[PDB]
Each structure stands twice: as C-alpha cells, then as structure tokens.
C-alpha cells in the first residue's frame, strides 16, 4: 500500500486512541478518589460545549463563591497569579526558562499548561483538559472535564450541556492532557478537497463498501454530523430504573459534573463513526466507522473526520 504513511493520521484508534464526541478515556485520582478525564492524543478542531437553557458560554469560569453551578461555565476560576485564560505569548513567557515547554506549538503548550496545575496540593496524575481559542490566542484550562449531561431524566436546577461543533466554536480546539507534540504530523486537521476516503485492496483504492448517508447542506454540517456520531466514552442516553428513582437530582448533578469513576465498558478507545466522505454535489455526508486506507480522486468529494476542522480544506 503506497498510502500507508499518508493515511496513518486517519487511523484514529491508533493516533487519537480515545473518544472524540466525549473523550473520557482515562481515570485519575484526586485526593485518593478516581475521576474520569480526557485522554485523546489528537486535538479536536472546532469542538465546544453548549450549555442548555442558559445564556452562559462554557469558557466562562466555573461557578464559585455564591454562584450556582448551572449559572457558570467550565473554565478555571481566576487565580493570582492569573494562569487561565492565558495567551500564547503569556504561556511562552511563563515557561521561558523551560526549553522543554517554551517552544511547543500552541495546542500542545496549552495542554501542557493545563496539565501543570495539580489539584492535589499534597501529592496526582489528574490533568485538566483545555480549550485553545485561535481567535484571541488564549488557552483556557477547563476545570470541568465533563462534556455531556443532557438526558431526559433531569434535562431545572440541573446543569445541562452537550458537546458539539458549531459556528460559534470553529476557532476552539478541545485538548486533553495527552495531546501529542507532533499532532501536526500525525493527526487530522484539514479536510481533503477533491478526495474521497477508500479502502486499499489488491493495488486499487476501492469505495468504502457500506456507508451511512446523512444529508448535509455543506461541509461544516457534514463535519458536525460525523462529530455527533463519532467515538464517544459515555452513552448518549444513560429494576435499575426503580433504584435510579431514589437518587437525588443535586447529587446527580455533582456526579455528572466531576465524574467520579465509581466504567471501562464505556471507553471507546477511539472506535466509532469517525470519518465521512462529503459529496458536495448530492449534499450527502457518507459516514462510516472503519479506518480508510487510501484516497480516491473525485472532484465531487471532500474527506472529513470528527477531529478535523469543520471548514479548512487542502
């Protein structure tokens, strides 16, 4: 296969290795209790969190003081010295003596800066995820690592939210603690214009044999759909029902926000509907869940993935 090196970055199980829609691929202890947290190795271009039934956007600081959780955002609260949000130039200055950090690209640097803040002032491997906003070149550490809480049961005083690609998020990038320093080389970013993903068989690039066709008005809408259907580390819809009726809603909110591990069955390890061939002429997003291993030249197509930016082409 002459395509092996080129296509390696589309083997999302291998190169990313965790959920994309919801990335909760590892667990880590904080003060001796385990919590779920993001672990994907690739940046997720254009992902943010929509907070339902609230005007607050998710990069606002988590609620502190007398603020209710449902009225705040996900980000680090203000500190002294102020370490989140921090501009790219601010991070480079902060780490100017550390040759191992100060020249990282913006996304890895933001991931490493978030991973610098140990919540165990006394010991821990828990490392917050982060969002880098390309519009104002700011790294936001996310204090809340949850990404979806939107089931029918409570979604109220309830903090309800879901991950999405959205025009409002197109310059955001969702970063776990594990984002690799060479993601430009090994992870998707650009959509591939005039190209269709295929499978290499016996010296020829064949079509993906089974795809799931979702209509989509443009590439952005196709990327949004692939993201919605992609690898995910928690169920989209969570006698066990009788026992759920004894749970308290406010306690449940807290569990859904901080994610105490007290479920590897849920981990995708990157398996899912991570790819789509967008036919711009028929307005079909042809979505599939097996890794592609070659490209077909076809001027009607753009090849996208759940990790890819929703607009940029090459």
């Amino acid at each position: 296969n002459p395509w092996t090196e080129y296509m390696a970055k589309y083997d999302i199980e291998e190169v990313h290795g965790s959920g994309i829609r919801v990335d909760l691929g590892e667990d880590a202890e904080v003060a001796g209790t385990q919590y779920r947290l993001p672990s994907g190795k690739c940046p997720v271009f254009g992902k943010g969190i929509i907070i339902e039934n609230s005007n607050t956007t998710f990069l606002k600081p988590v609620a502190t003081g007398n603020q209710d959780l449902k009225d705040g955002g996900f980000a680090f609260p203000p500190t002294n010295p102020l370490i989140s949000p921090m501009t790219l130039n601010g991070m480079r200055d902060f780490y100017k003596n550390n040759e191992y950090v100060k020249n990282l690209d913006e996304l890895t640097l933001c991931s490493r800066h978030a991973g610098n803040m140990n919540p165990d002032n006394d010991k821990s491997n828990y490392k917050y995820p982060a969002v880098y906003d390309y519009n104002d070149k700011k790294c936001h550490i996310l204090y809340i690592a949850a990404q979806e809480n939107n089931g029918p049961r409570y979604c109220n005083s309830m903090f309800c939210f879901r991950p999405a690609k959205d025009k409002l998020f197109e310059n955001y990038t969702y970063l776990s603690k594990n984002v690799v320093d060479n993601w430009e080389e090994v992870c998707p970013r650009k959509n591939l214009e005039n190209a269709k993903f295929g499978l290499w068989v016996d010296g020829n690039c064949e079509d993906i044999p089974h795809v799931n066709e979702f209509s989509a008005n443009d590439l952005f809408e196709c990327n949004k759909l692939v993201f919605e259907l992609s690898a995910s580390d928690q169920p989209k819809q969570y006698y066990e029902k009788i026992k759920e009726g004894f749970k308290n809603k406010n306690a449940s909110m807290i569990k859904s926000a901080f994610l105490p591990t007290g479920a590897d069955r849920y981990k995708s390890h990157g398996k899912g509907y991570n790819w789509g061939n967008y036919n711009r002429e028929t307005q079909k997003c042809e979505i599939f869940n097996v890794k592609p291993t070659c490209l077909i030249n076809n001027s009607s197509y753009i090849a996208t993935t759940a990790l890819s930016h929703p607009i940029e082409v090459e």
Binding site: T79, N80, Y95, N98, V101, N116, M117, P119, D120, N121
Partner: peptide, 13 residues
C-alpha cells in the same frame, strides 16, 4: 487550590 508540577513548583491557591 493548585500546585504547579513543573519547576519551579508554585502554589496557585
């Protein structure tokens, strides 16, 4: 509430 992991270690409350 946080302590930096990379030197120089620092309290950031």
């Amino acid at each position: 509430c946080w302590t930096t992991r990379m030197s120089p270690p620092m309290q950031i409350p």
